[PDB]
Design a protein around this nucleic acid. Sequence first.
RNA 1: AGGCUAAGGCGUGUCGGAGUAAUUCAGUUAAGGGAAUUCGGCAAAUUAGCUCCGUAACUUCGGGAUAAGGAGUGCCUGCU
RNA 2: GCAGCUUGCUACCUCGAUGUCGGUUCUUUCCAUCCUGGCCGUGCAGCAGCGGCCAAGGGUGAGGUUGUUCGCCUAUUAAAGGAGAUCGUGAGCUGGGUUUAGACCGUCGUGAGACAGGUCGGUUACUAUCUACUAGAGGUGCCCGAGGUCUGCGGGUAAGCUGCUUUUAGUACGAGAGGAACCAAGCAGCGGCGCCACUGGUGUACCGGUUGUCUGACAAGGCAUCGCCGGGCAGCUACGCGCUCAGGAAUAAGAGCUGAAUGCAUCUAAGCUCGAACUCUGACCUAAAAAGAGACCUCUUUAAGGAUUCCGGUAAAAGACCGGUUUGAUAGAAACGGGAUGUAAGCACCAAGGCAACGAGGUGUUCAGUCCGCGUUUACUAACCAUUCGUUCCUUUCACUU
Lengths: 132, 337, 62
Amino acid sequence: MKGMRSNIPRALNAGAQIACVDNTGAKVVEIISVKKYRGVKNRMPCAGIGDMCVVSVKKGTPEMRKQVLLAVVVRQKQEFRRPDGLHVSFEDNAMVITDEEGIPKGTDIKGPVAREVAERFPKIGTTASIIV
Amino acid sequence: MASIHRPKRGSLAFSPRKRAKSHIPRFRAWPEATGEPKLQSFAGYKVGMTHVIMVDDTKNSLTQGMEISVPVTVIETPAIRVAAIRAYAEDSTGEKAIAEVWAADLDPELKRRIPIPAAGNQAEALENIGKLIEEGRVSDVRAVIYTLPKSLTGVPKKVPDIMESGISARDLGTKFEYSKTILGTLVSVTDVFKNGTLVDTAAITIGKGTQGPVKRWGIQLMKGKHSRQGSLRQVGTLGAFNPSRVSWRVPQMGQMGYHQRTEFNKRILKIGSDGEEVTPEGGFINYGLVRGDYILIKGSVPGPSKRLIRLRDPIRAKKADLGEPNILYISRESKQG
Amino acid sequence: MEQRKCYFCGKMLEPGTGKLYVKKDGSTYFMCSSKCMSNFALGRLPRRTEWTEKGKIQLKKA
RNA sequence: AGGCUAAGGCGUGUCGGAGUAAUUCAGUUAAGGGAAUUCGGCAAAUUAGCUCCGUAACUUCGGGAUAAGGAGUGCCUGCU
RNA sequence: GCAGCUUGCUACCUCGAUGUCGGUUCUUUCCAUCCUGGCCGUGCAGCAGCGGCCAAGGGUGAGGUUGUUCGCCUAUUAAAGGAGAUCGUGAGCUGGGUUUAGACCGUCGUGAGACAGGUCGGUUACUAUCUACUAGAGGUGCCCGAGGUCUGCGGGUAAGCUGCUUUUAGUACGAGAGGAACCAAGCAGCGGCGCCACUGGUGUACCGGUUGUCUGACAAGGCAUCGCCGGGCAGCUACGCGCUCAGGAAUAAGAGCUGAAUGCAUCUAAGCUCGAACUCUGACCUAAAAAGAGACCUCUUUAAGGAUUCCGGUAAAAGACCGGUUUGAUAGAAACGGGAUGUAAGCACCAAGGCAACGAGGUGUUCAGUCCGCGUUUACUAACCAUUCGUUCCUUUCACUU
Ligand SMILES: [Mg+2]
Ligand SMILES: [Mg+2]
Ligand SMILES: [Zn+2]
């Protein structure tokens, strides 16, 4: 996809549980796999900020529960550096349920999201309220 | 057997991995001359690292036109002396040294490396070389230079380092004339490299002594229940039943570090003259403070501090002429704590 | 270079260094080192430790 | 009990020096993730004393039961 | 017909023992090609397919059941190819299955017992003699003696491989729906080599708080895993950072030119031109012990120079290597700069209280005290004093010397 100005470590790991931060109707998801990732032997797939990955809904409304979907990471607790020299970090990981293009199913996002996903996916930028 | 494929561990393009036979990097290939006469190399001593804030100007880059932070290595480069001229002859069995003429005036501290040559033939030897080139026997000319580490303070040694460089021109006669003009003089780093250009660096890397397969080749440890059965950092198998031998491509333990390595396309960001512009408070750790002229190199450079770094103009560069970087701030914070 | 001040020790950040800790609500804090970050995450208030600048401010009128 | 000291018995659970590699026996710590490792949570970690509140399905009515799940605890001054 | 990668057939070797199945680790080989490179045909408009030819350089992964190989299934992916190496690999590992002794269930037997059926349990020995390989040293050979700088007979390499997005372009093509390619740019995954300015880990130097106890109390200390908890410099390190190309020559399948046998025609019979991630060259690492055992220069043959002693570290398992030695900042002390922790002891005032004695604690002296395996200045102490090879040794087997 389009390159990002910043450098993002791949913090979250395939098997991780994230707290989805939208109003689609799910609370917790389970990262199954990461789009556009080959890998090598013995290495678990991993995902970072602005990575589209397929998940599974673990806690939420009955109709949404047990559904394989697509989502991207908007925050991560593992630090990453700006182009001009600085390190940014968060208190908690987060994710939003979206489509293949990037339109998020939710029309409201809670909490801040990293500006780099805002530049990569403009729709997440517009749907958010506070960007840091 | 359903095998899972894995790329080979480590690189065999650098074997055998043994200690370098000298403490001075030697160049095997010289570039093709594309301009006026000049030396193709230079020498200096590594000091340490800092970072600078420069307006980005790399063409087509994402971060163009905005500030960025870059790591830079500071290298001390006192002026060198061109001490001799060497002539080579081409035949079936490759080049062969056929003549040398030394300069009349030399530094008294060169006696520590070799006994000082005495001023015998200077004009007659040079005209001898000229006659050889006139009769079409000589093919190329190389210059012999040495460093003068007595002016520095962070480098304990006081004995010069001798090495051979190359002259860049489009004809043998021009090379000979330029070598005659510059023989027995001092050449500053500015006379060789222009600010903003690319260079190639060579040096002996840091030595780690004898190391095992895990840290020498990056093989996998023993996992799970096998991690507490007796062999954790040893290699899995030394070979098959047949052939009945251990291959040279199997990872084993031995010397690690202190080899010769080359880095490509390192950019020169600033040619300085006064050392107060790079010295942090308290000086560099284990070195001291800079006293002469220096040079800033983008990125990292092989070898530790107080190691000799050789520089030559690029041999496999792609990009066109870049331009003078715009340095805004050079960090002089304490490296300590 | 833009000048940003450390939240805990009240010290200017050298360019090319420092950190940025963003909170769940959205509040942002600037940390100049690991000492400030560690004392922040531990629970200390800048007003109470007197090696910080704010602590000096309360101790001047003490 | 475990820890720290008396009396009593010892420096003899009878090889020393030097301090610099890999590897090995037994330990301390580890960002982000949290069983994705493996035949299998093997191994290691978590919890842990005392007081108070509260305590399920089932039941041979004896139990289950320390169920589960929460709160308090130092030092100083004066007392009942 | 080929292969010996499934199962059979035989009984040539091994019963004074060649340690079984599967998985794990690591290395390599084959091509009968799954992807990546190049071509041909089509019932090939474009996109995407179907079939065949050359090509083994690189890639070929993560998970659920099962001891499993095999096989089924899940979400990615350019694709998630198949075989060989004593069904590679137990003086490397594991012990799940099979294959001992114990017991249960079903079926056989009159019974001891059996199953080719199921289930639970069940010891993994050794100090490396030879050779091979990975690294480090000492000799002897070539050679005027010593030192330096080079060449390069050779050896090695994947040092890079592969995707996504943007432009070309909503263009060619197509009725529309749909929809490419040459060049150009960035980013990413994996691999390789390095480094420590920034971030993270450790940091049994160091600073602080505190529990139990001991040295009579304060002060300062011992022991309890560094007693435990908090912070952390230097160094080491990755989860951090830097670099990571072509161009050319000769070719395979294949496409052509010229051209006769066979007046014509024909890519072939001579001859010639193009043509791949293959091969060679070019980058990169190593290499005079290259027996054709090298070239050049300088200094000097009772010397040049080399070693040992001495002060050290860019180096280091021992050896080796790289520096200094009074004509000197090589190591240490002193002071200062730069840092770590967090405001020392005593003294004064206040303190909930208490007739009083005492009083946890707070404020001031005090960014204090304590410490620095970092730098600067400075000969203040130590780098002094010497030995040894560059003579076969004695003999006058001597060109010497009493
Ligand atoms: Mg001993
Ligand atoms: Mg074996
Ligand atoms: Zn701060």
